[PDB]
Amino acid sequence: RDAFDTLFDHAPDKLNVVKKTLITFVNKHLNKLNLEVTELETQFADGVYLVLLMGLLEGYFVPLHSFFLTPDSFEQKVLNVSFAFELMQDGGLEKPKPRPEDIVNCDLKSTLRVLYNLFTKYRNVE
Amino acid sequence: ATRELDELMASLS
């Protein structure tokens, strides 16, 4: 039980503050590739934006053969998320708490945790 | 925006 469990159980009227702030953050970087997020609930589930964001935050071009740009199955989406998690750990982050499947399943708490830990680590990336 | 998220997360911890 972390602060995200406390947030959803005890202060759920503050979720909008978290959402907005993480949206601004992801868009600051994703906008460099002409990409945009309006909705954290759905738009990270296929793993594509999460992979590209790692390239953006650690400062490398992610080769397209290393993932699924247009995932057509649940398993291909899982593999994208697993690959972004791998790149997070390559950057020094500890193993994400959620399963890759939780992200594909649009679990919002899981999506918030992943994005917040990027937010905290990469706060200073211009 | 940014500070408010940090403050919130800290107070929930």
Author numbering:
A (entry chain B): 247 to 372
B (entry chain A): 1 to 13
In the authors' words:
The adaptor protein paxillin contains five conserved leucine-rich (LD) motifs that interact with a variety of focal adhesion proteins, such as α-parvin. α-parvin (Olski et al., 2001), also known as actopaxin or CH-ILKBP (Tu et al., 2001), is part of the ILK signaling complex (Tu et al., 2001), plays an essential role in adhesion-dependent PKB/Act activation (Fukuda et al., 2003) and in the regulation of actin organization (LaLonde et al., 2005) and Rac activation (LaLonde et al., 2005; Zhang et al., 2004). It belongs to the highly conserved parvin family that shares a common architecture composed of a variable N-terminal region followed by two CH domains (Olski et al., 2001). Our results demonstrate that full-length α-parvin contains a single LD binding site, formed by the N-linker helix, helix A, and helix G of the C-terminal type-5 CH domain.
To elucidate the molecular basis for LD recognition by α-parvin-CHC, we cocrystallized α-parvin-CHC with peptides representing the high-affinity ligands LD1, LD2, and LD4. The refined structures include residues 247–372 of α-parvin and paxillin residues 1–14, 141–155, and 262–274 for LD1, LD2, and LD4, respectively. All three LD motifs bind to the same binding site on α-parvin-CHC formed by the N-linker helix, the N-terminal part of helix A and the C-terminal part of helix G, which is consistent with our results from chemical shift mapping. Surprisingly, however, the orientation of LD1 is reversed compared to LD2 and LD4 in the corresponding crystal structures. Despite their antiparallel orientations, however, the binding modes of different LD peptides are very similar. As the result of a slight rotation around the helical axis of the bound peptides, the character and position of side chains facing α-parvin-CHC is largely preserved, the same hydrophobic pockets are occupied, and a similar amount of surface area (∼500 Å2) becomes buried. In addition, two positively charged residues (K260 and R369) of α-parvin-CHC are in close proximity to negatively charged residues of the bound LD peptides. Note that these electrostatic contacts involve the conserved aspartate D+1 of the LD consensus in the case of LD2 and LD4, whereas D+6 and E+8 are utilized in LD1. Consistent with their similar binding modes, all three LD peptides, irrespective of directionality, impose similar conformational changes in the N-terminal region of α-parvin-CHC, whereas the protein core remains virtually unperturbed. In particular, residues 248 to 264, which experience conformational change upon complex formation, are similar in all LD complexes with RMSD-values of 0.28 Å (LD1 versus LD2), 0.23 Å (LD1 versus LD4), and 0.15 Å (LD2 versus LD4) in 16 equivalent Cα−positions.
